[PDB]
Design a protein around this motif. Structure first.
Motif, short mmCIF file in Angstrom:
data_model
loop_
_atom_site.label_atom_id
_atom_site.label_comp_id
_atom_site.label_asym_id
_atom_site.label_seq_id
_atom_site.Cartn_x
_atom_site.Cartn_y
_atom_site.Cartn_z
N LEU A 24 -3.10 -3.01 9.72
CA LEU A 24 -1.72 -3.07 10.18
C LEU A 24 -1.66 -3.63 11.60
O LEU A 24 -2.38 -3.14 12.48
CB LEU A 24 -1.07 -1.67 10.14
CG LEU A 24 -0.74 -1.08 8.77
CD1 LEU A 24 -0.49 0.42 8.87
CD2 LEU A 24 0.46 -1.81 8.10
N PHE A 28 -6.18 -1.08 4.21
CA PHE A 28 -4.82 -1.54 4.51
C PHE A 28 -4.26 -0.97 5.81
O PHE A 28 -3.79 -1.77 6.65
CB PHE A 28 -3.90 -1.22 3.33
CG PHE A 28 -3.70 -2.38 2.36
CD1 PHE A 28 -3.61 -2.15 0.99
CD2 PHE A 28 -3.59 -3.69 2.83
CE1 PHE A 28 -3.43 -3.20 0.10
CE2 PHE A 28 -3.42 -4.75 1.95
CZ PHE A 28 -3.33 -4.50 0.58
N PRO A 29 -4.22 0.34 6.04
CA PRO A 29 -3.74 0.81 7.36
C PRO A 29 -4.62 0.35 8.52
O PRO A 29 -4.14 0.29 9.66
CB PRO A 29 -3.75 2.35 7.22
CG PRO A 29 -4.64 2.64 6.07
CD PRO A 29 -4.53 1.47 5.14
N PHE A 72 -3.76 9.82 1.64
CA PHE A 72 -2.74 8.77 1.65
C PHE A 72 -1.92 8.79 0.37
O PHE A 72 -0.74 8.46 0.39
CB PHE A 72 -3.40 7.40 1.84
CG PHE A 72 -2.52 6.38 2.50
CD1 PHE A 72 -1.53 5.75 1.78
CD2 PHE A 72 -2.70 6.06 3.84
CE1 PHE A 72 -0.71 4.81 2.39
CE2 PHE A 72 -1.89 5.12 4.45
CZ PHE A 72 -0.89 4.49 3.73
N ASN A 127 0.83 -1.19 0.00
CA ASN A 127 0.00 0.00 0.00
C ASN A 127 0.88 1.25 0.00
O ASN A 127 1.85 1.32 0.75
CB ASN A 127 -0.91 0.01 1.23
CG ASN A 127 -1.97 1.07 1.14
OD1 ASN A 127 -2.56 1.28 0.08
ND2 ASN A 127 -2.21 1.78 2.25
N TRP A 132 2.65 -4.58 2.47
CA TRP A 132 1.61 -5.61 2.46
C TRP A 132 1.92 -6.77 1.50
O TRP A 132 1.48 -7.91 1.73
CB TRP A 132 0.25 -4.99 2.17
CG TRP A 132 -0.30 -4.37 3.41
CD1 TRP A 132 -0.44 -3.02 3.68
CD2 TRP A 132 -0.78 -5.06 4.56
NE1 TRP A 132 -0.98 -2.84 4.94
CE2 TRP A 132 -1.21 -4.08 5.50
CE3 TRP A 132 -0.90 -6.41 4.90
CZ2 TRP A 132 -1.74 -4.41 6.75
CZ3 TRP A 132 -1.42 -6.74 6.15
CH2 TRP A 132 -1.84 -5.75 7.05
#
Ligand code: A1EQX
Ligand code: CA
Ligand code: CA
Ligand code: CA
Ligand code: CA
Ligand code: CL
Length: 462
Positions: free
Chosen positions: A375, A371-372, A164, A37, A103
């Motif tokens: 984490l 995605f974040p 982002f 990502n 990722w």
């Protein structure tokens, strides 16, 4: 290197189409590059040319990313596992060597653990491991990533505003350039205190001057006073008078209150002038850094001007600033290296547009936010933490050849963590790539590419 000359290839995967690079000779063990990502196979564009002369190079775009299809998914990690598992089978890859990042490394490690006889090597960098505490996360990005991990502020930041892509990504390459530019701005500000009108600055230009402002506003109250400017001017060796300090402040004091607030500072830093007078300001800042005037900024000279501007840099931070600036590798910074540090971002506009291209529609930005939120940080989410712990245990016990790339300060993988892993992983060689945060491919691709190709020649592959 800004281009992407690779022929696009696509393969049918669970009813969607996934894009991938496929270059190099057709025969032999394929090398599989997995991006993370918020990148795509574009992140490998300067690594693959070192490897493609002697190996098949396959680089997919994750589902929902790059040029791959964009179904209505949650884009959880376990969504990506499904599509990457099916992608690997669709290409008929019996054995592979893995080259993995962020990722993409969770994907590759999880796949390798489940298919350990099909993996002949793993090269990895800035990879997914359990982050024990938010203390191990870069301080400057702690607040933001915590905000990313919510459904209201995080989605408004990442999905509605594209933060982002437009902010996090250009800030995930390396850090020394922020410090060079903050101090160069303050040095140009000093000069401007001692054409006609001012520009209206973008929100991005304004924040760049926010750091420079903080150097003068010692007490943080939002204004620069006689005493604050005198402190600054003192350390620099240009010692002037309270009358001089007031007259300097008065030329920029729009509201007459005797102090400089941030808007008045912005108007001074936005002054219009011919390009050649803009250039003279940068030449003058270089001469300020270059104390002895020999044409090169030494490490010792940098230490003096950084302190005289109010920074308190460790030796590691000084070395980092030099090494990020030192294109020709002589350990010092000449005027051309100075200019690039002061006036250029880590990623060109052509490079930003390639990263931007998959996400021009906000409805396509779900993976950027999910995605974040996956984490593994401070034990959350617990299923991801559990999954990553399992392949880290496998990795510690596995004899697979391993190649670890790391930079300073890093993001996912701090230098001390890289040291721990270099010693406790079996058959692991570690390579210091120099300065970098997360996108080490944008810091030192030649070393990473070169080293991967030398490492491949030692493996049990064909
Ligand atoms: C494997 C994982 C890969 C890891 C890679 C990353 O590794 C390190 C890279 O950096 C880490 C990320 N840091 C940043 O993204 C980063 C760095 C500097 C800034 C700054 O504002 O100065 C910001 C921005 C932030 C930061 C914190 C916020 N907070 C506060 C209060 C509210 C919220 C909740 O909590 C406390 C809100 C923000 O709102 C922004 C809106 C906009 N915009 C665009 C369009 C409109 C809107 C306004 O103007 C232009 C633009 C920027 C930001 C983000
Ligand atoms: Ca103040
Ligand atoms: Ca004022
Ligand atoms: Ca010098
Ligand atoms: Ca140099
Ligand atoms: Cl992420």
């Amino acid at each position: 290197g800004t281009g992407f000359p690779f022929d696009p290839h696509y393969v049918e995967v669970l009813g969607e189409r996934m894009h991938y690079v496929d270059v190099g000779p057709r025969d032999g063990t394929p090398v599989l590059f997995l991006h993370g990502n918020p990148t795509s196979s574009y992140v490998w564009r300067n690594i693959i040319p070192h490897v493609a002369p002697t190996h098949r190079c396959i680089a997919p775009d994750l589902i929902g990313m790059g040029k791959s299809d964009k179904p209505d998914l949650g884009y959880f990690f376990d969504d990506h596992v499904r599509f990457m598992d099916a992608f690997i089978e669709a290409l008929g890859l019996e054995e592979v060597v893995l080259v993995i990042h962020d990722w993409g490394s969770a994907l590759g490690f999880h796949w390798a653990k489940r298919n350990p006889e099909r993996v002949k090597g793993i090269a990895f960098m800035e990879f997914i491991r359990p982050i024990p505490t938010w203390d191990e996360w870069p301080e400057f990005a702690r607040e933001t990533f915590q905000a990313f991990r919510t459904t209201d502020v995080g989605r408004k930041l990442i999905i509605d505003q594209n933060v982002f892509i437009e902010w996090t990504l250009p800030m995930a390459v390396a850090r020394a350039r922020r410090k060079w530019q903050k101090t160069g701005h303050a040095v140009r500000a000093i000069g401007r205190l001692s054409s006609g009108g001012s520009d209206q600055l973008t929100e991005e230009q304004i924040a760049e001057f926010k750091e420079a402002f903080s150097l003068f506003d010692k007490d943080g109250d939002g204004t620069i006073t006689t005493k604050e400017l005198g402190t600054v001017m003192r350390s620099l060796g240009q010692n002037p008078t309270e009358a001089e300090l007031q007259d300097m402040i008065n030329e920029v004091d729009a509201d007459g209150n005797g102090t400089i607030d941030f808007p008045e500072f912005l108007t001074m830093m936005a002054r219009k002038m011919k390009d050649t007078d803009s250039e003279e300001e940068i030449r003058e800042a270089f001469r300020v850094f270059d104390k002895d005037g020999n044409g090169y900024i030494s490490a010792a000279e940098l230490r003096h001007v950084m302190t005289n501007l109010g920074e308190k840099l460790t030796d590691e931070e000084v070395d980092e600033m030099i090494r990020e600036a030192d294109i020709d590798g002589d350990g010092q910074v000449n005027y051309e290296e100075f200019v690039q540090m002061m006036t250029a971002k880590y990623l060109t506009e052509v490079e930003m547009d390639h990263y931007r291209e998959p996400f021009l529609n906000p409805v396509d930005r779900e993976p950027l936010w999910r995605f974040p939120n996956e984490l593994p940080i401070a034990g959350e989410p617990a299923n991801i933490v559990a999954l990553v712990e399992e392949y880290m245990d496998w990795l510690h016990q596995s004899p697979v050849p391993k190649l670890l790339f790391w930079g300073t300060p890093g993001v996912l993988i701090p230098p001390a963590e890289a040291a721990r892993l270099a010693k406790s992983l079996p058959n692991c060689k570690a390579v210091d790539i120099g300065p970098g945060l997360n996108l080490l491919q944008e810091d030192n691709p030649d070393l990473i590419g070169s080293e991967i190709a030398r490492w491949l020649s030692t493996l049990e592959i064909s």
